[PDB]
Amino acid sequence: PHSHPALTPEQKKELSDIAHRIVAPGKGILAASESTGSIAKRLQSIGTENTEENRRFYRQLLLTADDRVNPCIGGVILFHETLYQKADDGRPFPQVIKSKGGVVGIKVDKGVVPLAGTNGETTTQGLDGLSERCAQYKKDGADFAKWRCVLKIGEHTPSALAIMENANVLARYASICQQNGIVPIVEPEILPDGDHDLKRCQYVTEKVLAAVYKALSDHHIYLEGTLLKPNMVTPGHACTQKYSHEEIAMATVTALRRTVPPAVTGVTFLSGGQSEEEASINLNAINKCPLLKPWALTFSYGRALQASALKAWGGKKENLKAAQEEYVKRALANSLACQGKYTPSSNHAY
Amino acid sequence: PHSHPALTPEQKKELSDIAHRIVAPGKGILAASESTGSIAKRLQSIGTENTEENRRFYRQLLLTADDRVNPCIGGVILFHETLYQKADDGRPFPQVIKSKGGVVGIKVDKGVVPLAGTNGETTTQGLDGLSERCAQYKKDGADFAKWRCVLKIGEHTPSALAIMENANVLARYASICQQNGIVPIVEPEILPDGDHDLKRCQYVTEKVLAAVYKALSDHHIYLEGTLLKPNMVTPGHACTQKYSHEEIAMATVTALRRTVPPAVTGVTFLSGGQSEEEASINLNAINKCPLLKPWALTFSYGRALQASALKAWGGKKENLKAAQEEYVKRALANSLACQGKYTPSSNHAY
Amino acid sequence: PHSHPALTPEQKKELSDIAHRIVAPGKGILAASESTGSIAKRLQSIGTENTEENRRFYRQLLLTADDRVNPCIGGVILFHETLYQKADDGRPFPQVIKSKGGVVGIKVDKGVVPLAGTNGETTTQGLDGLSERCAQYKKDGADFAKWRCVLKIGEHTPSALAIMENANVLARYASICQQNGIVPIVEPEILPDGDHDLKRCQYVTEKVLAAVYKALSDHHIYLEGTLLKPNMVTPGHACTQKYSHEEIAMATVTALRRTVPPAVTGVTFLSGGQSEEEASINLNAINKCPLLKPWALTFSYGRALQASALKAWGGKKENLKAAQEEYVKRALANSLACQGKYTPSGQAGAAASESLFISN
Amino acid sequence: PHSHPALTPEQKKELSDIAHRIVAPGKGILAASESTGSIAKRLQSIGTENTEENRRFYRQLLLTADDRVNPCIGGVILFHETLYQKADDGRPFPQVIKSKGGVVGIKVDKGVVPLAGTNGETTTQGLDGLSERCAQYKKDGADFAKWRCVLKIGEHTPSALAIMENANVLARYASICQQNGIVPIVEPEILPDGDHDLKRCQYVTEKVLAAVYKALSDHHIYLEGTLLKPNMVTPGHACTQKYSHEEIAMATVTALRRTVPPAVTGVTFLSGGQSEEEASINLNAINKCPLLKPWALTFSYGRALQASALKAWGGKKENLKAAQEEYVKRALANSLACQGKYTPSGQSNHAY
């Protein structure tokens, strides 16, 4: 085949530099790009009305936590709405994030859609006019993006079609992002839903990631200018057999070692509904795994970083401080976790 | 694999019946779905302000041609704007089309976008929210759709990426259309630009179509409920070697026979900028080709049906009758052509 | 991309002409390429010692049947051993076949081998030195070849790997054959084993054939110079739900119309485990199916053409005439079937009704 | 979407231990599996008759070099004939190799064959009966294998078919090998022939390796139990533009980092016609490259290890010691190179 440089040396350096800053040692990502529809249940759990002002207040609360979170947060992913909101002092949220040493990210997909002929499987949309949207987001402060694809482990899933199609759409999204100076975070999430075990999850994860990277190669994606946001390898949420954190860490690191090229700048694990402690302990175990890991292994958590903060807030302004404290606690815990320094107090079998 | 019926027997019958009506013996398609941007040039050539009124009048002029076109036109592709316009007498254009025995089609793609890392190649966008759009279009009179992908023959093109990506997006578009009772016309156009000869076009056409149908298969597309809108096999515009219409016909029919499954209801050849006469003579030769053709071989022409009409109209409402007369003559000419009855006055070598 | 002609117009003509002669109207194929270990079983049932002479004799019995089979047999597939054996008059079997207006075929695959990491799935070997073998077989009278790939319907089969690998190897085999003037019969057999239903078999057959032709395209295979030997679309041998011959034909022709390009010269169905009558009745229904069929739809039967013959012979040289008579009967029946003009109702024999199914 | 373990934990352990021993720190591979037809050219360059005894003597000359090569040679690839030959003392060559701390390898492919419809491209044959052959070779002292696929850079090559077919056959070969306790060395050699520059080779190498590993994944290949034998990324032999060893190293390591999973135990670079000295300097530069490399980067050299030895020997028994000394010198040099400690004495990242 013949080469037709998709990117210039300058464009590569920009993308690579951004990717490295986000996952710099001890740093991780705050995934706060929930939409009105997904954050609705969050707020209703604390009897708080889901208005634009309350969403703004809650996001301000997380974004303006004291400097203790600075060394822990390399990036913050915002939803469109939030990217254009301002703190009480009039400062745009992207500015608030940057001033704290964080890189600003933006969710760009437009949700999942049903794949006809499959057993409830989906693909993700959002490519239409994506280039122009990225150019605008870039001008408005964002340097990286989020696009979520969802795959499910079942009797006949994920199917060959679901894997191939989701891998392909992720490559398209990545290509467009890189053309506009936006570091794409590739997210092929395999849900923990089901009664499958650890080995089954490792197997599917390995097959999905191999497909993802072949697609990235086919689409001429610059890996140094990307990040990977995969599910950790864990047993199904309803799996009868139980496993230790060390087993989870081994399955996860092994799967990644067998599929993720060293060129990938970093891996930002999704929380996948895990609890704040569970997510921190597993990340720590992953970093302590005695196997060689050529990429940063950090976090990109949503509720695993917000759960306690949201609850402490309870929708009451006088609980601002108490709420931010909980967030700071999870940021500190996960910052230590991505270094294998967190303490709450035969690989051939894989 | 495991079957998870994308369509029910009823849905299949509906799509199959629509597809067959469009390409019924002697019938073809009037491709009139030009956008304001694509219609601009042609209106400029006749010194006419590109206004919605003139566009409506022009389209009205074509859609209201006398009853002689009825047995010639099985379908009419409209642009979004036109689908919601009405004739002077108040009748919605879709209704005008159906009263004349024609099926209403709607262009649903959102144009081409560049593929990074390629030598000027593209893919096509338009999948976002396509399902809701198809449902809306169906409710408003449309029974089939148009989606144009574009490939080019060059030194290193069409590339493996371009072929694969375009085939895949065409499959997604087809899948969504069929879920909403809309017959998708699969259009993988290979431009005639370049100095390549006839065999080079035939080779590329065979490779592209083979990739198209494998992709349709992977996406569980119901072939009986689709139509194929390919380029005819011809030498490039800059090719110095001359060929007869019989050779063009042999190369065309041979390429289709080697790649298009018999289950495909019909082939509606795109005019690809050919002249009115050229398009008719070639279609005629293709239908007279000795080889066995398991599918209808007809037309889906743009300028090949509108050329003389647009010119005779020249924006003059007074030329209405003269303009329509030109359109009628080409509809009649191509109706005979798709039956191998039009007259202006060794296969192993393929 | 760019075209680097794999074949010349002359080579294409020779391949196309051969493929057409094999499936000419009313003609089918006699699949007599059973190996020693495979035919040993057949000779065992009739209590006949599996020796080279008995095999030679039996094959001679089929190849030398009276001239009534001439218009019925377009081709005869032989095993390596048989290609080099002679009839009692010293005539090489290939010459015998040819003198009766038939094209000689040769089995070239070296059997199936297990695909590691799968649930009992396989792929087929035999590509090593295939080019030289084809060039030699061509000189020795062969004009087409046979290569069998086997897939099975189950909970997780056929897997993505099994389908892709078998489609790819078939494509390599077809490529090498065409380079040596040998028409390759593409055979992606989907076993009838299991309790799946008709629509399940149809779904799998469509997916398998789609993969097969995409692979043939990738490998620059000249379809007009090839033939397809697929399984008919039927329910699993253990399926409880019953289907009519018209339903089997509808499912079969539908799967074919949805995947097999018109350029393919002909489809020569394998009988699977169907009895002599079942194979004939289904083939007839297929040819009577209303749907448009751009390719010849005929047969390439092994036991579906030899069942009654073997029984009548029993290993007794004195039952020669009786044995050949049964073979001739099935050849005539299938010759009519591949034209949609077969109507049983008679003395076909109980042996022609017995299921020839053998678990895999 | 379901797993059916191709290998057991015991089988994986055996394959992993073998792969690691071969590329342990400071060790590389002696590629001495030249066929009679291939070795004929070598023997003729020194006016030596191509007989089985002369071939035996030559191979013995290499295999019996003094203990200095022991820490330098992790493996030795032999041709079928040599696997069954013996040293003067009667010791089977596989025993000689093992006694010196080396692992024995066997070439199992049956050469390249033309791919119809392509511009002189090929694929490789040799899968037929491969499983029985591996079981037999395993029993007779072999623990790893060699299978060479050849791709060429040209106006329209490597084509999609060539890349896909070669990647697939390499996967089938690896699968069969692992079922028989044999560590497969995956060899997708992209020839250096042509006037293409460094960037083009890097581009083609990246695409080829991407296809190779996707195929290995599709065939359920255990990467920890495999080694990769790729070409270094260099300009074409006819390229007018000149490049430094540092650039060749950066392009090479960059291509590997972008395509080879860290699970792969090691990369054993083929010499590909490079001179003895050039191959050592490039390997050393590769090991010094300021980028993270999660796999051993060593050698699997043929002529880059035998060139001088073959010449010094000249086919005369009296030159044995002089011939072995030449081989030993290259073994020591490359042992240092695959550690980045090589010296003639003996003691812009985003532009890729």
Asked if residue C42 belongs to a known ligand binding site, the reply is: yes
Residues C161, D131: C-beta atoms closer than 8 Å: no
d(CA B143, CA B183): 6
Instruction: Give the list of residues 6+ apart from residue D318 with CB closer than 8 angstroms, or none.
Output: none
d(CA A229, CA A298): 9
d(CA D213, CA D222): 11
A211: nearest CA in chain D? D214
Looking at B187, B206, B224, B276, which residue is catalytic?
A: B187
Asked if residue C303 belongs to a known ligand binding site, the reply is: yes
**CB-side neighbour CA atoms (13 Å) of A101:** 15
The answer to whether the CB of A269 falls within 8 A of the CB of A298 is yes
CB burial of residue A22 (10 Å; 0-12, 13-18, 19+): buried
Instruction: Count the helix, strand and coil residues of chain A and give each as a percent rounded to the nearest 5.
Output: 45, 15, 40
Tokens in use for A191? 């849900």
Nearest to C204 among B1, B217, B346 (CB): B1
- Tell me which residue has tokens 């400062």: A91
Nearest to C259 among B261, B292, B349 (CB): B261
Asked if residue A303 belongs to a known ligand binding site, the reply is: yes
Q: B297 pairs with which residues across the strands?
A: B267
Q: Compute the CA torsion angle A152, A155, A160, A166 (nearest 10 deg).
A: -10
Nearest to C175 among D116, D131, D219 (CB): D116
Looking at A187, A206, A276, A326, which residue is catalytic?
A: A187
E strand or H helix at C280? helix C276-288
CATH superfamily membership of D1-352 = Aldolase class I (3.20.20.70)
Instruction: Give the list of residues 6+ apart from residue C346 with CB closer than 8 angstroms, or none.
Output: none
- Cα Rg for chain C, rounded, in angstroms? 19
Chain B residues with beta carbon closer than 8 angstroms to that of A4: 117-119, 156
Q: How was this structure determined?
A: X-ray
Tokens in use for C220? 């620059």
Give the residue extent of every domain in chain D: 1-352
**C238: how many CB neighbours lie within 10 A of its CB?**
12
Residues C261, B263: C-beta atoms closer than 8 Å: no
Q: Which residues of D58-76 are buried (b: 16+ CB within 10 A; e: fewer)?
A: bbbbbbbbeeebbbbbbbb
Read off the amino acid at residue B196: H
A161: nearest CA in chain D? D1
Instruction: Count the helix, strand and coil residues of chain C and give each as a percent rounded to the nearest 5.
Output: 45, 15, 40
**Chains contacting C with at least 3 CB pairs below 8 Å?**
B, D
Nearest to D257 among A1, A258, A261 (CB): A261
The answer to whether the CB of B223 falls within 8 A of the CB of B261 is yes
d(CA C307, CA B23): 48
The answer to whether the CB of C299 falls within 8 A of the CB of C268 is yes
A123: nearest CA in chain B? B172
Q: Compute the CA torsion angle A285, A289, A292, A295 (nearest 10 deg).
A: -10
Residues B5, A127: C-beta atoms closer than 8 Å: no
Instruction: Give the list of residues 6+ apart from residue D282 with CB closer than 8 angstroms, or none.
Output: D232, D234, D245, D248, D249, D252, D274
Tokens in use for D241? 């533009």
The answer to whether the CB of C210 falls within 8 A of the CB of B171 is no
**C328: how many CB neighbours lie within 10 A of its CB?**
18
Residues B349, C9: C-beta atoms closer than 8 Å: yes
Distance from CA of C216 to the nearest CA of B (A): 10
Distance from CA of D44 to the nearest CA of A (A): 38
Angle at B21 between CA B19 and CA B24, to 5 degrees: 110
What are φ and ψ of residue C72, in 5° steps?
-90, -35
Tokens in use for B200? 């080079």
Q: B92 pairs with which residues across the strands?
A: B86
Residues B258, C203: C-beta atoms closer than 8 Å: no
The answer to whether the CB of C183 falls within 8 A of the CB of C20 is no
- Alpha helices of chain B — where are they, by DSSP H? 9-22, 36-45, 52-63, 80-83, 93-99, 130-139, 160-179, 198-218, 245-257, 276-288, 303-313, 320-337
Read off the amino acid at residue C120: G
d(CA D233, CA A217): 18
3-state DSSP assignment of residue B270: strand
CATH superfamily membership of C1-360 = Aldolase class I (3.20.20.70)
The answer to whether the CB of B269 falls within 8 A of the CB of B297 is yes
Read off the amino acid at residue C346: G
Nearest to A348 among D12, D218, D257 (CB): D12
Residues C131, D116: C-beta atoms closer than 8 Å: no
3-state secondary structure chain D: CCCCCCCCHHHHHHHHHHHHHHCCCCCEEEEECCCHHHHHHHHHCCCCCCCHHHHHHHHHHHHCCCHHHCCCEEEEEECHHHHCCECCCCCEHHHHHHHCCCEEEEECCCCEEECCCCCCCEEECCCCCHHHHHHHHHHCCCCEEEEEEEECCCCCCCCHHHHHHHHHHHHHHHHHHHHCCCEEEEEEEECCCCCCCHHHHHHHHHHHHHHHHHHHHHCCCCHHHCEECCCCCCCCCCCCCCCCHHHHHHHHHHHHHCCCCCCCCEEEEECCCCCHHHHHHHHHHHHHCCCCCCCEEEEEECHHHHHHHHHHHCCCHHHHHHHHHHHHHHHHHHHHHCCCCCCCCCCCHHHC
For chain B, list residues whose CB is within 8 angstroms of any CB belonging to chain C: 1-3, 158, 160, 199-200, 203-204, 206-207, 210-211, 213-214, 217-218, 223, 254, 256-263, 292-294, 346, 348-349
- Tell me which residue has tokens 């359109």: B327
**A174: how many CB neighbours lie within 10 A of its CB?**
28
**Chains contacting B with at least 3 CB pairs below 8 Å?**
A, C
Among candidate residues C109, C74, C8, C70, the one with its CA nearest the CA of residue C301: C74
Chain C residues with beta carbon closer than 8 angstroms to that of B293: 262
Nearest to A117 among B4, B126, B168 (CB): B4
Read off the amino acid at residue B321: K
Asked if residue C68 belongs to a known ligand binding site, the reply is: no
Q: Strand pairing of D112-114 and D122-124?
A: antiparallel
Residues C262, B263: C-beta atoms closer than 8 Å: no
Tokens in use for A311? 């609850």
Q: Which residues of A136-172 are buried (b: 16+ CB within 10 A; e: fewer)?
A: ebbeebbbbbbbbbbbbbbebbbbbbbbbbbbbbbbb
Tokens in use for C349? 């024999």
Read off the amino acid at residue D87: A
d(CA D101, CA C322): 72
Residues D156, C218: C-beta atoms closer than 8 Å: no
Q: A70 pairs with which residues across the strands?
A: none
3-state DSSP assignment of residue B223: helix
Q: Catalogue the active-site residues of D.
A: 187, 229
Say whether the peptide bond before residue D158 is cis (omega within 30 degrees of 0).
Answer: yes
Nearest to A258 among D16, D263, D293 (CB): D263
- Tell me which residue has tokens 């609360």: A61
What are φ and ψ of residue B233, in 5° steps?
-90, 115
Among candidate residues C94, C99, C181, the one with its CA nearest the CA of residue C141: C94
Asked if residue B300 belongs to a known ligand binding site, the reply is: yes
Chain C residues with beta carbon closer than 8 angstroms to that of D165: 168, 172, 219
Among candidate residues C234, C219, C320, C317, the one with its CA nearest the CA of residue C269: C234
Asked if residue A217 belongs to a known ligand binding site, the reply is: no
Read off the amino acid at residue D186: V
Q: Which residues of B51-82 are buried (b: 16+ CB within 10 A; e: fewer)?
A: eeebbbbbbbbbbbbeeebebbbbbbbbbebb
Q: Strand pairing of B144-151 and B183-190?
A: parallel
Chain D residues with beta carbon closer than 8 angstroms to that of C218: 160-161, 164
Q: What is the DSSP letter of A164?
A: H
Read off the amino acid at residue B313: W
Tokens in use for B26? 């002697």
d(CA D42, CA D30): 16
Is B187 a catalytic site residue?
A: yes
Chain A residues with beta carbon closer than 8 angstroms to that of D228: none
Tokens in use for A67? 């400097």
d(CA C329, CA C343): 13
CA distances from C244 to C248, C285, D128, D217 (A): 6, 10, 42, 43
Chain B residues with beta carbon closer than 8 angstroms to that of A115: 175
- Tell me which residue has tokens 């689908």: B83
Query: What is the total residue count of chain B?
Result: 350
Chain B residues with beta carbon closer than 8 angstroms to that of C12: 348
Among candidate residues A107, A19, A31, A25, the one with its CA nearest the CA of residue A72: A25
3-state DSSP assignment of residue B211: helix
**Chains contacting D with at least 3 CB pairs below 8 Å?**
A, C
d(CA B219, CA B226): 13
d(CA B204, CA D169): 26
B111: nearest CA in chain A? A128
Chain D residues with beta carbon closer than 8 angstroms to that of C154: none
Cα of D2 vs its chain's centroid, Å: 34
Read off the amino acid at residue A129: G
What is the topology classification, in CATH, of domain B1-350?
TIM Barrel (3.20.20)
The answer to whether the CB of C109 falls within 8 A of the CB of C35 is no
d(CA C289, CA A299): 61
Tokens in use for A5? 């440089």
The answer to whether the CB of A140 falls within 8 A of the CB of A104 is no
Q: C183 pairs with which residues across the strands?
A: C144
